[PDB]
Design a protein around this ligand. Structure first.
Ligand SMILES: NC(=O)c1ccc[n+]([C@H]2O[C@@H](COP(=O)(O)OP(=O)(O)OC[C@@H]3O[C@H](n4ccc(N)nc4=O)[C@H](O)[C@@H]3O)[C@@H](O)[C@H]2O)c1
Lengths: 329, 329
């Protein structure tokens, strides 16, 4: 009998066919997240699982699935997995590197341009049917000559700087790890401290990992150091920005706008956590621009992420050591 | 008429004999890489292609080979292939299992010993004809009693630690995921943070698994934390080490030497890659030891890689789903 593989979320039909040669596949045929109780029910006698961001693989999950030999995570960050529990239960845990970086950088620049040029309200004005030509409205803020700061010059930060290098801006970054001289010259980016960054920037773009030290890194104290009329673009992680302080800074005029691909509400791991995006942000269509965690939502990229997770499962089930393993069961 | 298979690079004669049973084989009789135009000229009417590291398969290539049914990559990865273009053109794309671990670990230790014991300069002095017996020269650094640190503890790192376990060294490692307690005791290897590792090590060996690769893990900041007089050995991947930072550390005396099997000029997916090994490294024969990507240049391993690629081609040409498929055409 073939091993069984459960996929918790929708995958491209080619991926199901690929896995079907060596396993019986139980897919999620909908675009929705199944409740944890239904994922566990399907996985209880599975040999393999393809896991996604909404899955929380803890010891209780693994105890319900005694046949599991590999979890192929279609993800880079494995915060939602208990790796040591996987290891103790004899379960390979694999991830996918690199693939999310560039589409997230591209989306961040889209949020920057959409927010600073009032493009959403512009589209709404077009859809109203009342367009009759140019009007002296929706005057925004341009990029050339402005100062943009990247907090965290890592994979996404470097992808963003490379792309903004052609926009004739003044680019700053802060990071405990500096770029080298060739990189700083290539992108014309200057290293500063976080305080200097917050002081000088028209646009602030946090791209740090979520850690104890970066929880609410952009809080009321950071916003108070920022330039009046500045913009904040958040596509890193939901709780790096204090959304209640942002609401206050928009109300007072400290921030001219806020754009975000990520939200505190999706950080289910923290106890003090809201279950909805604050209404004062949702109602403020004039000053905000939001996307539902679309950072890596590019069809060709999602397919290659799914392919890497599938190959890890195939390799593990064949008795090989999977290419993306982070543990050793 | 049998189908035709084009092999872009040299293979062992028994592989050509294996393929000859079901296909007419067009080999590369030389040890050279053919220009792309010649590969296309051979493969325009081929049913199958065996591809290697120097190959790159894009949509334009596939448009010129309308009879192609399978590309069997003699590779454990597929960065140089447009997988979805293969799929859309009806072409199977296959890979082989990762067979590189142990020969890479062995070569890394060869690099360590050759570099630290001045063996290349020693051989030069022998061939100069002027050897007249022992002299107080070419004094190097030994292994016993010294501290060596492996950054990353996946398959290759574990192979290195197992082999260095008998050398009476102080072995350290860092990895987000720890080794088993039985392995730590068996190899006498101790987990430390990266900072502790860089601080304590006479020898530093970056060997991060594919899931943990990051650009310039060893940069100017890391090198400034290392011990003065230390040695750096890179058989991992070119992008792991900032080669211009290394040149500066050799020049300053921070590094006593650098050995490498891989080079930044090899990173054809990174936009800002170089196209030569820096002249300041090539000239420095006194403090460097280099090999041209030989980590798995072992006859047994190369043969098995070719054999698996040939079997995939044979399977696909016979109308089966090949065992190493990564797509579904
Ligand atoms: N919206 C999405 O769908 C999406 C997609 C992918 C990723 N993400 C997010 O998940 C994270 C991973 O981003 P990353 O760039 O891949 O992570 P990393 O390379 O480790 O970060 C650079 C680091 O910054 C550090 N650092 C640390 C502390 C400090 N006080 N200052 C620092 O500066 C340190 O030195 C290093 O350079 C965010 O970046 C963000 O992108 C979202």
């Amino acid at each position: 009998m073939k091993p069984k593989v459960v996929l918790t979320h929708w995958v491209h039909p080619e991926i199901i066919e690929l896995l079907s040669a060596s396993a019986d596949v139980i897919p999620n045929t909908t675009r929705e997240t199944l409740p944890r109780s239904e994922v566990i029910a399907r996985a209880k006698d599975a040999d393999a699982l393809m896991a996604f961001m909404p899955d929380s693989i803890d010891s209780a999950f693994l105890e319900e699935c005694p046949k599991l030999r590999v979890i192929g995570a279609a993800l880079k960050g494995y915060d939602n997995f208990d790796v040591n529990a996987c290891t103790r239960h004899g379960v390979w845990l694999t991830i996918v590197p690199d693939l999310l970086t560039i589409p997230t950088a591209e989306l961040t620049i889209g949020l920057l341009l959409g927010l600073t040029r009032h493009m959403l309200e512009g589209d709404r004005q077009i859809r109203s049917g009342h367009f009759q030509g140019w009007r002296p409205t929706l005057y925004g803020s341009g990029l050339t000559g402005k100062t943009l700061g990247i907090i965290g010059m890592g994979a996404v930060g470097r992808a963003i700087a490379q792309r903004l290098a052609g926009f004739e801006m003044n680019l700053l970054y802060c990071d405990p790890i500096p770029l080298n001289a060739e990189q700083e010259k290539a992108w014309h980016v200057q290293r500063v401290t976080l305080d200097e960054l917050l002081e000088k920037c028209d646009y602030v773009v946090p791209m740090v990992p979520m850690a104890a030290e970066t929880l609410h890194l952009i809080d009321a104290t950071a916003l108070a150091k920022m330039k009046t009329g500045s913009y904040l673009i958040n596509a890193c992680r939901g709780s790096v920005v204090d959304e209640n302080a942002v609401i206050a800074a928009l109300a007072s005029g400290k921030l001219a706008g806020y754009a975000a691909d990520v939200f505190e509400m999706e950080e289910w791991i923290r106890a003090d956590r809201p279950q909805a995006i604050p209404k004062a942000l949702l109602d403020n269509t004039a000053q905000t621009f939001f996307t539902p965690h679309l950072g890596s939502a590019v069809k060709e990229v999602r397919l290659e992420i799914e392919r890497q997770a599938a190959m890890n499962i195939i390799q593990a089930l064949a008795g090989e050591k999977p290419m993306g393993a982070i543990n050793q069961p």
